[PDB]
Design an enzyme around this catalytic site. Sequence first.
Site, short mmCIF file in Angstrom:
data_model
loop_
_atom_site.label_atom_id
_atom_site.label_comp_id
_atom_site.label_asym_id
_atom_site.label_seq_id
_atom_site.Cartn_x
_atom_site.Cartn_y
_atom_site.Cartn_z
CD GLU A 79 -1.70 2.31 1.82
OE1 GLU A 79 -0.54 2.46 2.34
OE2 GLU A 79 -2.63 3.15 1.96
CB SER A 121 -26.89 25.84 -20.51
OG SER A 121 -27.93 25.82 -19.54
CG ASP A 126 -29.19 -7.72 -8.23
OD1 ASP A 126 -28.47 -8.03 -7.23
OD2 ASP A 126 -29.49 -8.59 -9.12
CG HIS A 165 -17.49 7.56 -9.05
ND1 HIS A 165 -18.38 8.62 -8.93
CD2 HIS A 165 -17.98 6.56 -8.29
CE1 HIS A 165 -19.39 8.23 -8.16
NE2 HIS A 165 -19.16 7.00 -7.74
O1 LIG Z 1 0.35 6.18 -2.99
C1 LIG Z 1 -0.71 6.52 -2.41
O2 LIG Z 1 -1.75 6.86 -3.03
C2 LIG Z 1 -0.74 6.65 -0.91
C3 LIG Z 1 0.42 5.89 -0.26
C4 LIG Z 1 0.38 6.19 1.29
C5 LIG Z 1 -1.01 5.92 1.95
P1 LIG Z 1 -0.99 5.96 3.75
O3 LIG Z 1 -0.97 4.54 4.16
O4 LIG Z 1 0.28 6.72 4.25
C6 LIG Z 1 -2.48 6.63 4.47
C7 LIG Z 1 -2.76 7.98 3.95
C8 LIG Z 1 -4.28 8.28 4.05
O5 LIG Z 1 -5.13 7.49 4.49
O6 LIG Z 1 -4.67 9.37 3.60
C9 LIG Z 1 0.83 7.63 1.51
O7 LIG Z 1 0.01 8.57 1.65
O8 LIG Z 1 2.11 7.89 1.51
ZN LIG Z 2 -1.58 3.36 5.72
ZN LIG Z 3 1.50 5.34 5.22
#
Ligand SMILES: O=C(O)CC[C@H](CP(=O)(O)CCC(=O)O)C(=O)O
Ligand SMILES: [Zn+2]
Ligand SMILES: [Zn+2]
Lengths: 694, 694
Positions: free
Chosen positions: B370, B574, B610, B633
């Site tokens: 992450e 518009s 659904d 989105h």
């Molecule tokens: O690369 C990304 O989009 C985010 C990677 C990480 C996510 P994080 O785990 O530290 C949590 C940041 C949050 O929840 O806003 C960052 O902000 O450095």
């Molecule tokens: Zn995090």
């Molecule tokens: Zn982080």
Amino acid sequence: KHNMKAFLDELKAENIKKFLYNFTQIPHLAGTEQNFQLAKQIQSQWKEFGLDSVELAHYDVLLSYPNKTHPNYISIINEDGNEIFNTSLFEPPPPGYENVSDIVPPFSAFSPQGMPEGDLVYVNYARTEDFFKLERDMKINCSGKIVIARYGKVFRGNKVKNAQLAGAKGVILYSDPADYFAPGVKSYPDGWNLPGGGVQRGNILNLNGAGDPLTPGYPANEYAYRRGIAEAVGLPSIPVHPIGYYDAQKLLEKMGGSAPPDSSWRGSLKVPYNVGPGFTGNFSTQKVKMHIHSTNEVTRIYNVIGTLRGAVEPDRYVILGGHRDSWVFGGIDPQSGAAVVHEIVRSFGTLKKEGWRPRRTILFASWDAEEFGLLGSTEWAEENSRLLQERGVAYINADSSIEGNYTLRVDCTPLMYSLVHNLTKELKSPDEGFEGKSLYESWTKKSPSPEFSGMPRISKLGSGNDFEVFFQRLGIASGRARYTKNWETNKFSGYPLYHSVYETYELVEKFYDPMFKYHLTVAQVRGGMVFELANSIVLPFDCRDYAVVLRKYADKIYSISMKHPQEMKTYSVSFDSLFSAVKNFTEIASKFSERLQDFSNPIVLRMMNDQLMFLERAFIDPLGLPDRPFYRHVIYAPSSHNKYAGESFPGIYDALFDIESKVDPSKAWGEVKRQIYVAAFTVQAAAETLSEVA
Amino acid sequence: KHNMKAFLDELKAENIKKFLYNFTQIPHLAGTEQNFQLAKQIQSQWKEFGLDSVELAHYDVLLSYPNKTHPNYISIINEDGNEIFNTSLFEPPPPGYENVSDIVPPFSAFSPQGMPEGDLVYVNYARTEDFFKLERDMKINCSGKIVIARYGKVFRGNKVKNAQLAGAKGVILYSDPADYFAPGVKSYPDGWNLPGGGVQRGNILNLNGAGDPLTPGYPANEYAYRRGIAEAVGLPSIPVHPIGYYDAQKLLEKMGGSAPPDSSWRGSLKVPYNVGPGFTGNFSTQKVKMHIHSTNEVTRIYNVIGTLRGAVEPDRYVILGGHRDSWVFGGIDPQSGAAVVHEIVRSFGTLKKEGWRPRRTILFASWDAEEFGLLGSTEWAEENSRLLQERGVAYINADSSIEGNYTLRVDCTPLMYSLVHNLTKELKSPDEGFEGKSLYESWTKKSPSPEFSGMPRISKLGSGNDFEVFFQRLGIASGRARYTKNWETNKFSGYPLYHSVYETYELVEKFYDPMFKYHLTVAQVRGGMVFELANSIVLPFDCRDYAVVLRKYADKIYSISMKHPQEMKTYSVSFDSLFSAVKNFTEIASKFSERLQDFSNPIVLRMMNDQLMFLERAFIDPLGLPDRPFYRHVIYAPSSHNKYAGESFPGIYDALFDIESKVDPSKAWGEVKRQIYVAAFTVQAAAETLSEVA
Ligand SMILES: O=C(O)CC[C@H](CP(=O)(O)CCC(=O)O)C(=O)O
Ligand SMILES: [Zn+2]
Ligand SMILES: [Zn+2]
Ligand SMILES: *[C@@H]1O[C@H](CO)[C@@H](O[C@@H]2O[C@H](CO)[C@@H](O[C@@H]3O[C@H](CO)[C@@H](O)[C@H](O[C@H]4O[C@H](CO)[C@@H](O)[C@H](O)[C@@H]4O)[C@@H]3O)[C@H](O)[C@H]2NC(C)=O)[C@H](O)[C@H]1NC(C)=O
Ligand SMILES: *[C@@H]1O[C@H](CO)[C@@H](O[C@@H]2O[C@H](CO)[C@@H](O[C@@H]3O[C@H](CO)[C@@H](O)[C@H](O[C@H]4O[C@H](CO)[C@@H](O)[C@H](O)[C@@H]4O)[C@@H]3O)[C@H](O)[C@H]2NC(C)=O)[C@H](O)[C@H]1NC(C)=O
Ligand SMILES: *[C@@H]1O[C@H](CO)[C@@H](O[C@@H]2O[C@H](CO)[C@@H](O)[C@H](O)[C@H]2NC(C)=O)[C@H](O)[C@H]1NC(C)=O
Ligand SMILES: *[C@@H]1O[C@H](CO)[C@@H](O[C@@H]2O[C@H](CO)[C@@H](O)[C@H](O)[C@H]2NC(C)=O)[C@H](O)[C@H]1NC(C)=O
Ligand SMILES: *[C@@H]1O[C@H](CO)[C@@H](O[C@@H]2O[C@H](CO)[C@@H](O)[C@H](O)[C@H]2NC(C)=O)[C@H](O)[C@H]1NC(C)=O
Ligand SMILES: *[C@@H]1O[C@H](CO)[C@@H](O[C@@H]2O[C@H](CO)[C@@H](O)[C@H](O)[C@H]2NC(C)=O)[C@H](O)[C@H]1NC(C)=O
Ligand SMILES: *[C@@H]1O[C@H](CO)[C@@H](O[C@@H]2O[C@H](CO)[C@@H](O)[C@H](O)[C@H]2NC(C)=O)[C@H](O)[C@H]1NC(C)=O
Ligand SMILES: *[C@@H]1O[C@H](CO)[C@@H](O[C@@H]2O[C@H](CO)[C@@H](O)[C@H](O)[C@H]2NC(C)=O)[C@H](O)[C@H]1NC(C)=O
Ligand SMILES: O=C(O)CC[C@H](CP(=O)(O)CCC(=O)O)C(=O)O
Ligand SMILES: *[C@@H]1O[C@H](CO)[C@@H](O)[C@H](O)[C@H]1NC(C)=O
Ligand SMILES: *[C@@H]1O[C@H](CO)[C@@H](O)[C@H](O)[C@H]1NC(C)=O
Ligand SMILES: *[C@@H]1O[C@H](CO)[C@@H](O)[C@H](O)[C@H]1NC(C)=O
Ligand SMILES: *[C@@H]1O[C@H](CO)[C@@H](O)[C@H](O)[C@H]1NC(C)=O
Ligand SMILES: *[C@@H]1O[C@H](CO)[C@@H](O)[C@H](O)[C@H]1NC(C)=O
Ligand SMILES: *[C@@H]1O[C@H](CO)[C@@H](O)[C@H](O)[C@H]1NC(C)=O
Ligand SMILES: [Ca+2]
Ligand SMILES: [Ca+2]
Ligand SMILES: [Cl-]
Ligand SMILES: [Cl-]
Ligand SMILES: [Zn+2]
Ligand SMILES: [Zn+2]
């Protein structure tokens, strides 16, 4: 009882004949008042027949029409600029129609305006391999030439694209009697052959699934933002015009330069079929001059959408659709199909009036502007894509019911193979010599599967008809069926009177199907398919049939690649992942089939029905194919060389095509590998939709 | 009974504390053996806790690491090339960890290598408006300069993108005490403030939703085709490195050139905050020199995926997910969230062992990588997109449970507003002074809605966490909740010890939540949401809440446009179509709500379930937003100026942004109109998914 037999028995040849007559008395060109009036008629009648709701869905889309006071034509022009020969301004009207108004003269829809003058080059059918032959083998250069090409073999828009990229400054399309005059049959009105003054209309766009050229991705509704013409999708950059073979003979007879490279380049006219460029010695100073003045114009079109609400699963849609607009009278294309749909609606409405409702919702559609590039079906699918994506079970097309009277012609997803086999075994053959035999029996005999004894041929879906948005964009299981001719090499060329003023009610009633028995047989196949799809408790799809074809397509694409063994070695090009995925799909599908047989539980049933409905959906890649974002199915796409033809593993196929000619082999084989990865991944992902859900 | 109360009462603060301790003893950097070992541990424990299946899903993705034998650092270099000052090679380790191995030194993940030398320009927070101020107002040119920017306000990757496009040749990021040292609190280990040697790690990519830089659109599995590094997504083109405020003071103290334009540019260090370029007279010949030697390396990562199969609707997925990888010990980020998930799994497993099963399937995820750009969640969603698209009910995130101890912080789709309000009214507040009061009551008091009296604030979703692929790419209703600080202007800046070696178990146990009561409250909110989503007969979404916000966003975007009345006149701009669609949505949603209340019929129920599940799905545009194909989105996207912030009607917002500076106003306002059309169309289409189905 209210079962499929009740439905089928209600269908009448006599009614199909009456409707065909009714739909073919005047032209119904898209965007004209006559076609809006016919829309309102069908809307009223479907209401009378019993449908729950019937609405018009309109759009404002780019259409194309000749200028009524400034006719299109082609000349041979002598040195002083005298036009010494002019092609015809209209087709001689058939008997009894010589006073019909509003017959659009022959033209190529969406041609730009221009009056290019130049030397002719004859390019055979203007296929990719014809231009390869000219440019690579014969060293003939089309740049700044006017190309003349015979219709046939591939969609006309592909011809025009090929001519443009060869540097042509104009294209003349004509009907050669080799392709449009069957030996031993008389010309219209005394037979079904094309007369020398007959001309095939048709659009020459290369939309690749986009729909209205001005609004790709979004419906052309009242507030739509439109691209400027210069950014429109698919419009040709050079003028184009079609002519008959009397006129073609005059343009070809004087041709000089190189001889035809071989006999496959020679049609049936009494001319040399010299490739050019230009005319033989005496006439070397004469040129050909086109005069094209057609205009593109945003114009309102109207789809009719009828709903028969399902009793149990109203939120599951089975769609029977086909077009209503024609070039002229539409005696075959589309009204032979529209009359069949009309009778199907009437039959379903008869059951409904007696208290029956199908299990799932059935939607019936009369599409507009099909002839101008599938515009009405595409704009409506753009508008309703979310509903269709999450609720669409299947789409059955219903254009021309006959293009011959020899045997059945079915193109469909593998998911419908079993349904088609089973239904046709229960229907009577209309064929002479097969009385008391099943349609399955006559069809399998006349059109044997190239792979399996005792099975009929069923072809792949490409494009060139209204199922394209549903199948190739949205991944809804689709199928089509019609009666066809024997003529193998004419498969994509059309019947002789295609898109001519001679395609009339009388053509059908006298020469194709006087008893309307082939029409009735097609009404039984289309209506029978819709009935089973909309009423079967378990959807009538067999995932194992997809497994079998996926292996066949994987063998085929691998065999193409294996013509280049040194490069596969150099660049480490493996098909192992794709065969793995196909093996997995086969295994998983077999297990899913066992559960579907082995599973009173409506949630498990619908769970399983959803797995069946979403299986075609799983072959969609949301990023689309390279440079064709609206062709999203990874297993099938319209051929990049011929929109009418389906191609399997199209992304890998196009990466391999003509690869030996690419300047950077590393890059080209890297893209082959990328497409193998995308295909393996998508096959595996589709397989996994059939695994146990949790 | 096995109801929500049974579930909630089983959750224990003491267990969350034990798990937090267990997860924070060594670093768990993505791609390292320690993090693979923790994955296997969680997999084993979730099996023991009672889940039906628990698997590892691995991928090989691009990660980034410093060179262990060639450290990154920054110098001031004098005229002869002597490095007269060097920044630190590591953060002084906290008490009792000074012998812990494998603490990654501070670095900016995915920085290219380089040793650029040049003059400094100070750019405040390196926001779009900071560069506008420099370039447009102060006429300061960043081209070929090294930029120094303070962390805070926006995602660091946005800062780096902004610096690159200003022509910077390097970026130095630092933590100013203005943003990372709360007045009156002591530095770690004696309080929760950032010491002068502390440094915030973090990646500086601009992936816009792509996932692994080398495999956009497809999972990074064993046979994946990878882009070459030069074609990778989102990598910065200039070196970047982070430093603490002791080091920053040394680089800033000598700065000359222009004064700061105003006080919003001044932090809390005892320096002028001159913008530069370069140093004051005496030191005018000294330069700054970066030395960056980090490498990007394809590396294996591991997600843990646990399944609790639904009793009634096994093919409907409610997902609780959050990450496991940390920069160092992860005492808050992510293990305060991971320990909460662990206890939630344990509680659900306790019910399961007593014979209970949720109505729908619950999936639990421990995501990897992450911190390197949401890689593990994105690659898994790429792999399983078809299943998620057709079966995903909702995604609840579970990163850091605390970032303060003041009140609740919830960001979610409007579809979950009612669920959150109702659940928080049934939970006890953990806050001092609110004993015996509901969490709803304390939260609403401490974080009042800016629009409604007696309601709490709930924010929009952008990105910067693992819900991004599920919400912005795939359109699955998503939500998140955590405890937070009071600090308004610090919302996107992180707590002081964010991504430092000082973010430890002791930080949490001593200074944030010694009784683990805020952790327990967050476990109740996250687990309570999952329980209701997975168990409620009717899904707990209220479409009318989307109608209310859509009007608010339409008013807001119109108000932006209306700053340019002459151009709206000139170009006929518009918003009528968008307000029409919003009015229609409001009308249709009201009617759907009546039916949902007025409708024993499981098919009607699931039909309606659904319609509820696919409503978020309907806001997805398959063509994506301009130049951001993985943000699909239409109502929400991550801000193009700050990935952490959600933006509403992003396509129209970005078309209007800074429009007065565009050279071709006709073209620019045409694109505003195009985006209004796309937004109106999508709102109307989403509305129509809630109409009667047939
Ligand atoms: O690369 C990304 O989009 C985010 C990677 C990480 C996510 P994080 O785990 O530290 C949590 C940041 C949050 O929840 O806003 C960052 O902000 O450095
Ligand atoms: Zn995090
Ligand atoms: Zn982080
Ligand atoms: C068809 O379905 C089968 C499942 O029946 C599925 O098999 C999977 O294949 C992948 C790719 O081979 C296997 O991946 C391996 O997973 C193990 C861990 O389980 C890893 O250790 C392996 O990596 C090592 O070896 C690699 C190859 O030499 C090295 O490149 C790598 O660096 C590692 O040293 C490897 O990732 C996976 O285990 C099976 N899953 C099973 C059997 O359950 C197959 O992928 C499906 N086909 C397609 C096209 O999806
Ligand atoms: C919100 O929902 C309403 C339905 O309650 C929906 O209303 C529809 O609005 C469209 C656009 O106004 C209407 O379209 C008209 O349709 C008639 C035929 O029914 C046409 O004749 C109209 O075209 C003429 O007038 C135009 C405008 O002056 C000209 O530009 C044009 O050339 C024609 O002369 C026009 O197309 C439609 O009838 C209603 N449908 C209803 C009331 O059932 C509205 O569109 C929805 N909002 C959004 C954003 O979708
Ligand atoms: C095709 O059939 C339709 C429907 O029977 C005919 O239209 C009807 O004709 C009568 C006589 O003019 C009218 O009173 C009805 O109102 C029409 N019904 C409709 C439009 O639903 C139409 O005349 C036929 N067309 C041809 C060429 O035979
Ligand atoms: C082909 O048609 C063209 C255009 O109508 C004819 O040329 C025109 O003839 C008229 C009357 O003689 C002249 O006034 C025009 O100046 C001519 N126009 C052009 C464009 O050349 C031509 O006669 C026709 N050729 C044949 C063989 O019928
Ligand atoms: C086509 O018909 C065949 C033969 O009836 C169907 O296959 C049978 O289905 C029944 C009901 O599940 C099974 O018990 C038989 O074992 C099947 N017989 C076979 C495979 O030979 C088949 O399902 C039909 N296809 C459809 C309806 O799509
Ligand atoms: C975190 O808790 C886990 C699970 O209790 C501990 O791992 C277990 O430790 C014992 C003693 O070494 C082993 O015999 C087990 O096989 C392990 N169980 C697993 C991995 O499921 C681990 O020691 C704890 N970590 C810390 C730092 O306290
Ligand atoms: C900053 O670090 C650099 C690099 O380690 C130091 O410069 C080196 O010093 C050694 C020993 O004196 C020399 O042999 C190298 O040639 C130098 N390398 C470079 C890259 O200049 C420098 O002394 C340090 N500066 C301070 C103030 O400590
Ligand atoms: C939040 O709780 C409210 C109050 O209970 C729920 O709204 C009620 O729902 C019941 C059951 O449909 C209705 O009969 C009441 O009229 C509703 N009361 C109102 C609107 O004040 C609401 O459904 C809950 N939201 C959820 C579960 O998402
Ligand atoms: O534009 C298109 O894709 C096809 C337009 C029409 C379709 P059509 O109605 O004539 C039927 C052709 C077919 O079914 O293959 C054409 O081929 O000229
Ligand atoms: C048709 O004929 C001529 C061509 O210039 C002219 O009077 C009129 O503009 C044309 N109509 C069009 C272009 O639609
Ligand atoms: C074809 O002809 C034109 C003549 O102007 C020229 O520009 C082009 O390069 C030629 N192509 C080849 C391959 O001979
Ligand atoms: C219809 O069938 C008969 C029998 O072969 C044949 O003579 C005739 O040519 C067919 N009609 C068409 C148009 O193919
Ligand atoms: C780390 O240090 C030096 C840099 O040149 C060298 O020995 C080694 O290649 C580096 N390792 C890398 C680049 O991963
Ligand atoms: C900024 O500085 C560099 C100096 O080389 C120059 O190339 C660039 O045009 C300058 N931009 C402006 C707007 O002054
Ligand atoms: C926790 O709450 C108390 C009460 O206001 C406060 O003094 C302390 O600073 C808070 N801890 C953090 C880290 O915000
Ligand atoms: Ca469109
Ligand atoms: Ca990927
Ligand atoms: Cl058809
Ligand atoms: Cl979170
Ligand atoms: Zn047709
Ligand atoms: Zn046609």
